[PDB]
Design a protein around this ligand. Structure first.
Ligand code: SAM
Ligand code: MG
Length: 1205
DNA sequence: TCAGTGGTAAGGTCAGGAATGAGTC
DNA sequence: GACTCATTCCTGACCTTACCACTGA
């Protein structure tokens, strides 16, 4: 990938530059403690030399550092560090870009040397470069070049001279003299460990051929900080870090060509510009009244130097570059000279605002480079750009005015204002000037609000005049006047930019919801934007219309939420009664490459500033694809809708923008009863989801309400889950003992308490695969993600009819139309239509029974009874065939039932509906398509299904060995705590056919040394179940099925060898996958070598388990290893040659196993000395980290690395 | 002002084949 | 001069859960 190099390099470059700046600041006596407090040292001046603690500098540097100290007090230390770091990074990147394109006058490279790695070409042409840059002191430099030493100082002087020369062209990025940042430039630039080496030889020089590279830098420099700050409340200083992305080029072209190009083409329909714009959309045919209305406002002529384009959040300047291209085409069409166009465009067409200085620097550099591509003599003229960063007003009020001395030069310096001094307009009045006071009062919190600040248009022209005077006082004034003007210019310039009215506003606004916005921004939004205070992009969308003149265009790409969510309903009304929709492309998710996830789902629109309710917009539906496919579809004008008036959006209550809905569906939807207040929201813990919720297998069943009797601490809860219909997702339990006293002590939100333990339906709030509802029996609670539906005391609708309706294709389509924003909130579900019928109830009952039968066939459900294979006593292959037939019968029955339901629904409405995503999917584990996903072809999961079935059989056998299950009775047998009551169960005869282990420790060895070896007991289980006569073929079938998918086949081995290899290699991972990182059989392993491994049943563990494990399993194993090692030593001397080679090579393995087992035995003795007791109520996650490194995969389960004694 | 219910998110995890790289033989 | 395993390397698919926000008494 082209962007991989920059993506890897940029954050590391940020870290390196920050470290260098911090070190340089510490050398200057400026530092911050752990808490962040300033630690400015005291400067001691002796022998015309300043000292800051231990370090010393010449006296000449004393004043400059003082300014840095001021910047350390008026702003934070971290702000100063970040600013200096990215300033130097941007300067170096700009120099590199200009040297790779030959834009430097001397024509030699600065940061590198062609065809010579780790060299600088500038040092080979010192006289020429010195004459070009430092004519007054070239000879001395030559002398330095003659010295042979002190090359670092020479290179530093040359680089600083290059920067000072570049100051004139780009005042926004380079300084000229008395620059504080020169003190922070790192030394040892020419060495092999400098910051320049990474920049030079970490990015290929072929990546600098286009301006686009700049944009990538703009995104990749700050990615780590974005990851650090995202997800919580964002401070004002961190606002840019969370909202800085790079917009794809085709989206920008679509936005620009349909706003500026459209304005040009309206006046000049027959112009050679439409052929140069690939993304220009032809308007649909309109009624004669609409055409007559439009023709009455179109001007008869447009002057090219009158089109004003503004980017309220310029960022890297991509939108400005595309606008520049379009305007250059327009100027060339009008017939201007080629080399004069760029200056005109940059001086009277392009305007840009940003809240971050880095973005302003990058945008200015990008615009200048794009102009330089066309004009050779540019960068030598005083081109003044109108792309700025907003500055917060904190300077003094009257001191700057006194320094300015306006009356001395022209007039209005003592009391002359826009009005008389004594008028005292509004509250700001005129302490020095009416206009100046009013302007400065508006930017007291600029670094938080940005471009949302409103400036009256009536003050525009006056401001302009004032600005002009400043432009003359910075060139034709004394020192005080020059510095006062240089201080005042940015505020007046930003005010004038905000006070102007524009033909088009094109932007990609920041996205930030209610959680991320801080208090000041939130209260400002509440006061100023009542209809769009819930998000930042909505505020930008509403504020952009106030910056437009009449008949202007607003073109933006933002979140799709405002199209559908209720929080923006009022906003939509305000849009449908005052504005005109021109065009829209709905992009959905997977747009904006280099961004992952489905939170960001976007739409790009162009809207006019006038009102016409009978206009027909053009819509494109580009939701379901990736970025390249979306671009190709947009280029081919695919998925177009042009048959809906703008007023027609107001027929549906709430006025959603549902452009792709059909008229018949709308008519059916309007005249149909809704679900109503039957749907309610579930409970929610305050911040303790991991304290009160468990998975069912990891607690005792005596305290489980669904299984136990009397006392109940744990209750089943519906929490959502993946797509599943009519039954399932019964996997979570909550602590609700004594009516949730512990929950009430935690200030939990127990919503709708009176509906608990009732039967009803439940759906998943957060989903991206479609809508589904499942039956919920009595004795259940429901979470906020598992919101529920309940029937009234006596209503005409039963719960089964509602379930039948909600799982049909009609409701699926309607839910897709109503809730396309990743959430199915209760208020949106409350308006789903419901249909009353009689057959639907029995059809839903049959579907629920089938789904329950499908769900209860695995160990993961607490209603599991027994393994399905062992019910047939004929043969293992015969049992597998019967199992497959049973699953097929279930699948066919459910298919028929759903088909009948859909037919009944369709014959009532009177029309057929289009199939939607997973509209006909059957959500059963008996269906391989649902279980293993969709492949390119069918009949490709037979081997995987067979392997999974055999693995489940082996897991059931292990569970029978542990005593969890039995062959004499169905369901769970022993799931209590601390091995209490197991002796009574064993004495009663619950394991008569297949006895259980006497202590709950199963050695997972690689030999038949132990009598309770797992492989031998699996063989015994197979013999007991399917008889003795056909044992060998059953074992062969099991081994072949395991080798099909679970493990790789081996050249030569028997069935038992394959079983042992699977048990020692794959069983643990399968168990962890099945129980989802909450195991009930814990694996104790010695290490990378299988010296000793065992399985312990969690429910049979007690404080005497480790001692028994050490005594009965580890010490005899050590004795056996010692005896075996002693045996091999005797045979080595007797044998010789190649005969003894195998003995020698196996003795080393035996020695390694013995040493590892001794270390593990020492650790086990230490941990067994402390009698460790665990409470199952604490959960597997907490209890799994109490044994150090004795357990396997501690980090994957607990989440943190195991500790060492 | 506090109860009692609803709303929303420039994201976060995870299975699952392709590289990548140290032991064997 | 290949084999054989144990780590990354994305890559596409899928659902949070905490903390606001909005009425009634
Ligand atoms: C995603 S960038 C878009 C830049 C440009 N469209 C591009 O693709 O390069 C959004 C920018 O808006 C800026 N921004 C955030 N909040 C702002 C505010 N309140 N006022 C003005 N600009 C703001 C951020 O600094 C950020 O750089
Ligand atoms: Mg045992």
């Amino acid at each position: 990938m082209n962007t991989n190099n920059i993506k890897k390099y940029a954050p590391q470059a940020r870290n390196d530059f920050r470290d260098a700046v911090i070190q340089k600041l510490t050398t200057l006596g400026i530092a911050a403690d752990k808490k962040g407090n300033l630690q400015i040292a005291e400067a001691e001046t002796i022998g015309e030399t300043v000292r800051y603690g231990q370090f010393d500098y010449p006296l000449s540097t004393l004043p400059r550092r003082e300014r840095l100290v001021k910047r350390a007090r008026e702003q934070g230390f971290e702000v100063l560090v970040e600013h200096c770091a990215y300033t130097w990074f941007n300067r170096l990147c700009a120099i590199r870009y200009m040297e790779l394109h030959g834009y430097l006058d001397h024509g030699f490279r600065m940061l590198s040397h062609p065809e010579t790695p780790t060299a600088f070409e500038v040092l080979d042409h010192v006289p020429e470069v010195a004459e070009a840059l430092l004519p007054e002191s070239k000879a001395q430099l030559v002398e330095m070049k003659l010295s042979g030493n002190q090359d670092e100082a020479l290179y530093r002087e040359l680089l600083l001279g290059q920067c000072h020369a570049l100051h004139h062209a780009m005042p926004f990025l380079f300084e000229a003299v008395d620059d504080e940042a020169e003190l922070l430039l790192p030394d040892n630039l020419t060495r092999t460990d400098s910051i320049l080496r990474g920049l030079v030889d970490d990015i290929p020089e072929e990546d600098w051929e286009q301006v686009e590279v700049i944009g990538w830098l703009y995104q990749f420099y700050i990615s780590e900080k974005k990851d650090a700050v995202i997800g919580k409340v964002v401070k004002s200083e961190d606002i840019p870090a969370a909202t800085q992305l790079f917009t794809p080029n085709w989206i920008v072209q679509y936005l620009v060509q349909n706003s500026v190009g459209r304005q040009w083409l309206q006046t000049y329909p027959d112009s050679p510009l439409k052929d140069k714009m690939e993304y220009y959309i032809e308007p649909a045919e309109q009624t004669p009244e609409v055409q007559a209305q439009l023709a009455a406002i179109t001007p008869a002529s447009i002057e090219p130097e009158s089109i004003k384009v503004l980017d309220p959040a310029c960022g890297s300047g991509h939108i400005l570059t595309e606008a520049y291209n379009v305007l250059k085409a327009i100027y060339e069409e009008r017939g201007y000279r080629t080399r004069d166009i760029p200056q005109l465009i940059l001086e009277n067409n392009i305007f840009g605002l940003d809240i971050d200085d880095r973005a302003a620097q990058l945008s200015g550099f990008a615009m200048l480079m794009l102009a330089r591509q066309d004009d050779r003599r540019i960068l030598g003229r005083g081109v003044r750009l109108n792309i700025v960063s907003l500055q917060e007003s904190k300077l003094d009020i009257a001191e700057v005015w006194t320094k300015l001395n306006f009356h001395q030069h022209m007039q209005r310096g003592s009391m002359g204002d826009m009005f008389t001094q004594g008028t005292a307009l509004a509250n700001t009045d005129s302490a020095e000037y009416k206009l100046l006071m009013r302007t400065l009062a508006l930017f007291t919190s600029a670094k938080t609000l940005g471009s949302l600040i409103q400036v009256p248009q009536e003050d525009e022209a006056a401001l302009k005049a004032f600005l002009e005077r400043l432009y003359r006082l910075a060139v034709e004034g004394d020192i005080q006047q020059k510095e006062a003007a240089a201080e005042l210019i940015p505020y007046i310039q930003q005010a004038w930019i905000l006070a102007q009215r524009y033909d088009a506003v094109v932007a990609n606004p920041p996205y930030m919801g209610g959680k991320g916005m801080n208090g000041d921004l939130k209260e400002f939004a509440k006061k100023q934007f009542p209809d769009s205070k819930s998000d930042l992009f909505a505020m930008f969308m509403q504020h952009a219309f106030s910056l437009l003149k009449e008949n202007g265009f607003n073109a933006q790409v933002n979140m799709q939420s405002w199209m559908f969510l209720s929080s923006y309903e009022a906003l939509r009304g305000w849009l449908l009664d005052n504005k005109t929709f021109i065009t829209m492309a709905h992009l959905g998710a997977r747009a904006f490459g280099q961004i992952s996830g489905e939170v960001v789902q976007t739409t790009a629109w162009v809207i006019k500033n006038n009102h016409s309710g009978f206009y027909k917009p053009v819509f494109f539906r580009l939701v379901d694809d990736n970025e390249e496919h979306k671009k190709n579809n947009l280029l081919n004008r695919m998925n177009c809708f042009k048959n809906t008036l703008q007023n027609d959006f107001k027929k549906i209550p709430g006025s959603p923008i549902a452009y792709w809905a059909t008229l018949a569906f709308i008519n059916s939807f309007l005249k149909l009863p809704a679900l109503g207040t039957r749907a309610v929201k579930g409970l929610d813990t305050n911040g303790s989801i991991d304290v009160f919720l468990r998975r069912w297998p990891e607690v005792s069943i005596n305290s489980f309400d669904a299984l136990g009797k009397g006392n109940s601490k744990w209750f089943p809860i519906a929490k959502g889950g993946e797509l599943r219909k009519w039954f399932g997702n019964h996997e979570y339990i909550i602590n609700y003992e004594n009516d949730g006293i512990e929950l009430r002590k935690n200030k939990a939100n127990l919503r709708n308490k009176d509906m608990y333990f009732q039967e009803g339906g439940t759906w998943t709030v957060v989903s991206t695969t479609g809508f589904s509802m499942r039956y919920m029996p009595k004795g259940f609670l429901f979470d906020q993600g598992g919101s529920a539906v309940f029937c009234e005391n006596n209503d005409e609708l039963s719960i089964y009819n509602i379930l039948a309706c909600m799982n049909s294709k009609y409701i699926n389509y309607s839910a897709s139309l109503i809730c396309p924003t990743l959430n199915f909130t209760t208020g949106d579900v409350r308006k789903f239509p419901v249909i009353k019928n009689n057959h639907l109830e029995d059809l839903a009952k049959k579907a629920i029974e089938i789904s329950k039968a499908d769900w209860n066939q695995f160990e993961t459900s607490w209603e599991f009874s027994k393994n399905k294979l062992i019910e047939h006593k004929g043969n293992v292959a015969y049992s597998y065939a019967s199992y497959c037939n049973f699953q097929d019968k279930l699948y066919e029955q459910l298919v028929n039932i759903e088909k009948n339901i859909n037919n009944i629904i369709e014959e009532i409405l009177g029309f057929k509906i289009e199939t939607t995503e997973n509209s006909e999917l059957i959500t059963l584990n008996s269906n391989k398509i649902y279980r293993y996903g969709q492949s390119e072809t069918n009949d490709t999961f037979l081997n995987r299904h067979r392997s999974d079935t055999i693995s489940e059989l082996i897991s059931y056998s292990v569970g029978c060995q542990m005593g969890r299950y039995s062959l004499d009775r169905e369901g769970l047998v022993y799931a209590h705590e601390g091995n209490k009551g197991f002796a009574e169960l064993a004495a009663e005869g619950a394991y008569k056919t297949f006895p259980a282990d006497n202590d709950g420790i199963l050695p997972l060895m690689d030999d038949e040394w132990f009598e309770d070896d797992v492989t031998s007991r699996v063989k015994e289980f197979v013999r007991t179940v399917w008889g003795e006569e056909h044992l060998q073929e059953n074992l062969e079938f099991i081994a072949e099925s395991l080798c099909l998918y679970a493990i790789k086949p081996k050249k030569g081995e028997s069935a038992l060898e394959t079983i042992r290899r699977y048990l020692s290699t794959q069983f643990w991972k399968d168990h962890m996958k099945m129980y989802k990182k909450r195991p009930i059989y814990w694996l104790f392993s010695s290490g990378k070598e299988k010296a000793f491994e065992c399985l312990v049943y969690l429910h049979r563990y007690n404080d005497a388990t480790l001692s028994r494990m050490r005594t009965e399993y580890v010490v005899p194993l050590l004795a056996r290893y010692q005896a075996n090692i002693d045996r091999l030593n005797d045979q080595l001397d007797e044998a010789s040659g190649g005969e003894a080679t195998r003995l020698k090579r196996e003795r080393d393995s035996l020695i390694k196993k013995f040493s590892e087992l001794r270390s593990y035995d020492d650790r086990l003795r230490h941990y067994a000395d402390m009698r460790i007791s665990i409470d199952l109520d604490d959960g597997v996650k907490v209890n799994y980290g109490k044994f150090g490194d004795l357990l396997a995969d501690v980090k994957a389960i607990t989440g943190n690395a195991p500790e060492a004694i």
